[PDB]
């Protein structure tokens, strides 16, 4: 459970994976013990800002107007103006395309009702409803964090698998990222990491390697 054991797991996952014509990602898998997932409070659905990022930044879309839209343009983000909300609702094909092309959505708070009404049917089931922010909010800090954010989601099962980086990053960075993921479990349960039954590290198409 210590850093050295994590470092060894990352190393092995990396070495045991047959090379491929694409940058593989490291996935961290953890099974949980003595946690009753029938109780909604025990489930995990928390965002985690990875210290060294996901390897490739997460794609963010901003739904809004005024200066929120301007900031989104300045940050090089996809912008969906208020008028486009209903247009997207009529073009579900395009909306699904946009949903699939982005990891997170940010939206002007006063537009959430409209967004839920026309875009929610697509974003909701995909866990991509927007994080609301005041229309006068400075979104750079939020965008910075989201670009390096991954989501731990157990649903109603005693385990989770989450992205922790890619092979272009160093093993040290991957372990730092994994530690950030583990800190979530540490803070959620009273006994913390005592609940980790088994942990594994694997590359996209490589074998899962058990930690320690």
From Swiss-Prot:
Known CDD domains for this protein?
Ribosomal_L1
Record-level GO BP terms? regulation of translation; translation
**Keyword Nucleotidyltransferase belongs to the record:** no
Do you know which InterPro entries this protein is assigned to?
Answer: Ribosomal_uL1, Ribosomal_uL1-like, Ribosomal_uL1/biogenesis, Ribosomal_uL1_3-a/b-sand, Ribosomal_uL1_arc, Ribosomal_uL1_CS
Please give the PROSITE patterns that the UniProt record associates with this protein: RIBOSOMAL_L1 (PS01199)
Q: Name one GO molecular function term.
A: rRNA binding
**Family as reported in the entry's similarity comment:** Belongs to the universal ribosomal protein uL1 family.
Q: How is this protein organized at the quaternary level? A: Part of the 50S ribosomal subunit.
Q: What does this protein do?
A: Probably involved in E site tRNA release. Binds directly to 23S rRNA. Protein L1 is also a translational repressor protein, it controls the translation of its operon by binding to its mRNA.
| NCBIfam families, A to Z | PRK04203.1
PANTHER family registered for this protein in UniProt: 54S RIBOSOMAL PROTEIN L1, MITOCHONDRIAL, LARGE RIBOSOMAL SUBUNIT PROTEIN UL1M
Q: Under what name is this protein listed?
A: Large ribosomal subunit protein uL1
State the organism named in the record.
Methanocaldococcus jannaschii (strain ATCC 43067 / DSM 2661 / JAL-1 / JCM 10045 / NBRC 100440)
The beginning of the lineage is: Archaea, Methanobacteriati, Methanobacteriota, Methanomada group, Methanococci
The encoding gene:
rpl1
């Amino acid at each position: 459970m210590d850093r050295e054991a994590l470092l060894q797991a990352v190393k092995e996952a990396r070495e045991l994976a047959k090379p491929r014509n694409f940058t593989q990602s490291f996935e961290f898998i953890a099974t949980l013990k003595e946690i009753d997932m029938r109780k909604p409070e025990n489930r995990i659905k928390t965002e985690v800002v990875l210290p060294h990022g996901r390897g490739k930044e997460a794609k963010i879309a901003v739904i809004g107007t005024g200066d929120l839209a301007k900031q989104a343009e300045e940050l090089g983000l996809t912008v969906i103006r208020k008028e486009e909300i209903e247009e997207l609702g009529k073009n579900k094909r395009k909306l699904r395309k946009i949903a699939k092309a982005h990891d997170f959505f940010i939206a002007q708070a006063d537009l959430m009702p409209l967004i839920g009404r026309y875009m929610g049917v697509i974003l909701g089931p995909r866990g991509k409803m927007p994080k609301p922010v005041p229309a006068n909010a400075n979104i750079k800090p939020l965008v910075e964090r989201l670009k390096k954010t991954v989501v731990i989601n157990t649903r109603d099962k005693p385990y989770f698998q989450v992205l922790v980086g890619n092979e272009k990053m160093t093993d040290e960075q991957i372990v730092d990222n994994i530690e950030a993921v583990l800190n979530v479990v540490a803070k959620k349960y009273e006994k913390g990491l005592y609940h980790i039954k088994d942990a594994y590290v694997k590359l996209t198409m490589g074998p899962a390697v058990k930690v320690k």
